[PDB]
């Protein structure tokens, strides 16, 4: 029917300050999906120490379409970090919809400054846990 499908996914990474990934290495989430009948599968991929030299001071975060879609997929997405109260903070939005094929990622190489994240005063790493939040809005042709 082409009805827009909206859904959210959240993922807690333990001991985030101790992650050994260096620049360009990736942490992968589990797959997730809507509650509709299409059953597109998605995942998040995060670069704890940045994608590349340009984003070396940042956490980099991407949404990837994992499964094989039956028709064209266009999606909007927004990433945020949950504080200890579960409140969304430091949100970054795609604004426009992007075309996804199987294996395609879209995201922000400069999602958040690593030094801002690691400062306990900002409350984004309670108990050294990083909880990432993604909302996806998808239309299928």
């Amino acid at each position: 029917s082409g009805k827009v499908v909206k859904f959210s996914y959240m993922w807690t990474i333990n001991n985030f300050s101790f992650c050994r990934e260096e620049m360009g290495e990736v942490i992968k989430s589990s797959t997730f999906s809507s509650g509709a009948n299409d059953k597109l599968k998605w995942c998040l991929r995060v670069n704890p120490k940045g994608l590349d030299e340009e984003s070396k001071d940042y956490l980099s975060l991407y949404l990837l379409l994992v499964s094989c879609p039956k028709s064209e997929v266009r999606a909007k997405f927004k990433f945020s970090i949950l504080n200890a109260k579960g409140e969304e903070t430091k949100a970054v939005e795609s604004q426009r919809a992007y075309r996804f094929v199987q294996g395609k990622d879209w995201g922000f190489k400069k999602f958040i400054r690593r030094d801002f994240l690691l400062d306990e005063a900002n409350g984004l790493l309670p108990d050294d846990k990083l909880t990432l939040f993604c909302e996806v809005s998808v239309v299928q042709d």
Partner: peptide, 7 residues
């Protein structure tokens, strides 16, 4: 704006 790591 968003970036991608593929063509």
């Amino acid at each position: 704006k968003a970036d991608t790591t593929t063509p």
